[PDB]
Amino acid sequence: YSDELRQRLAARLEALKENG
């Protein structure tokens, strides 16, 4: 189980990773 939900986690991180 790491080919579907793993992507979901990345999505949350995207927004947070645009400030520093």
Distance CA 17, CA 4 (A): 21
- 3-state helix, strand, coil split of the chain in percent (to 5) is 60, 0, 40
Distance of CA 14 to the CA centre of its chain: 6
Q: Is 20 helix (H, G, I), strand (E, B) or coil?
A: coil
* Backbone Cα Rg of the chain: 10
CA distances from 14 to 1, 4, 11 (A): 21, 16, 5
Give the chain's end-to-end CA distance (angstroms, integer): 31
